Amino acid sequence: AHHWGYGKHNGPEHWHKDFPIAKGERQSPVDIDTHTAKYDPSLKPLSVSYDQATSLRILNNGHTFNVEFDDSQDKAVLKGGPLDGTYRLIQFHFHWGSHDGQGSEHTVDKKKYAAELHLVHWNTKYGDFGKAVQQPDGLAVLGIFLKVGSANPGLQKVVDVLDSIKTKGKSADFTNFDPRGLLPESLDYWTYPGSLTTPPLLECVTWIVLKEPISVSSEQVSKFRKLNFNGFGEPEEPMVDNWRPTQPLKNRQIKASFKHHHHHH
Ligand SMILES: [Zn+2]
Numbered sequence: 001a002h003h004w005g006y007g008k009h010n011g012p013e014h015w016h017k018d019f020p021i022a023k024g025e026r027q028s029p030v031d032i033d034t035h036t037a038k039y040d041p042s043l044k045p046l047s048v049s050y051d052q053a054t055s056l057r058i059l060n061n062g063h064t065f066n067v068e069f070d071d072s073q074d075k076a077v078l079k080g081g082p083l084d085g086t087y088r089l090i091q092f093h094f095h096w097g098s099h100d101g102q103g104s105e106h107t108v109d110k111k112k113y114a115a116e117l118h119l120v121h122w123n124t125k126y127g128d129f130g131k132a133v134q135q136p137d138g139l140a141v142l143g144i145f146l147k148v149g150s151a152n153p154g155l156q157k158v159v160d161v162l163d164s165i166k167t168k169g170k171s172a173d174f175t176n177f178d179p180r181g182l183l184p185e186s187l188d189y190w191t192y193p194g195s196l197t198t199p200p201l202l203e204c205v206t207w208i209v210l211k212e213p214i215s216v217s218s219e220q221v222s223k224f225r226k227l228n229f230n231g232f233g234e235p236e237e238p239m240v241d242n243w244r245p246t247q248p249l250k251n252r253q254i255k256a257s258f259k260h261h262h263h264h265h
Pocket of ligand 1: 093094095118197
């Protein structure tokens with residue numbers, strides 16, 4: 001069984017014992033130092049085509065909630081940017097804090113956001129997600145920060161169903177959710193090679209982290225915190241602070257698709 005979680009006894013500092021790649025050379029998340037994450041003019045615009053996305057289900061898996069998609073065809077796909085080929089959307093999930101001052105996995109010049117959205121996509125050349133996660137170019141994860149402010153209409157359908165999946169293992173039908181409602185205006189981004197941010201921590205991810213956050217109301221993020229890590233019939237453990245701290249960049253380069261205000265050129 002899995003021991004790992006986010007507590008003091010089983011959290012990120014313990015993960016390397018079962019998953020020694022936790023101390024690897026390409027671990028995520030990372031701090032994005034915007035001065036050293038240089039503009040790369042060879043980076044193409046991202047193509048996020050979600051108009052035909054087909055959501056299926058929403059699930060509390062004991063460490064986040066996932067919205068799952070039908071990935072049997074090239075409907076919802078990510079391409080362009082740093083990517084070679086076509087990556088199919090399989091699910092999205094969030095990381096959030098116990099309070100509005102923390103929650104994101106990536107940081108920008110050490111700044112944390114209240115939450116972070118991960119849209120997970122796999123490379124169609126590999127046939128399915130399980131095959132893709134075994135390869136360095138297998139996954140592309142689009143990371144989007146959530147900044148507390150005005151309520152986000154694009155998030156409300158998700159928040160409204162969370163009361164039906166309060167405990168680990170619970171799921172609910174969740175059709176016709178349009179993930180276009182979770183995208184900011186700008187598709188400017190940073191990109192680097194990294195890992196899954198939960199066990200098994202495989203170094204199979206091209207990370208694409210958007211510059212522009214999307215909004216979330218304080219009330220909306222509070223509803224994330226009403227979920228529980230525990231299963232039905234166990235003492236309640238609120239699902240909060242389900243984020244891994246930032247990991248050493250080591251020899252990697254973060255590239256920017258745009259000129260940041262910290263770049264003279
Ligand atoms: Zn994640």
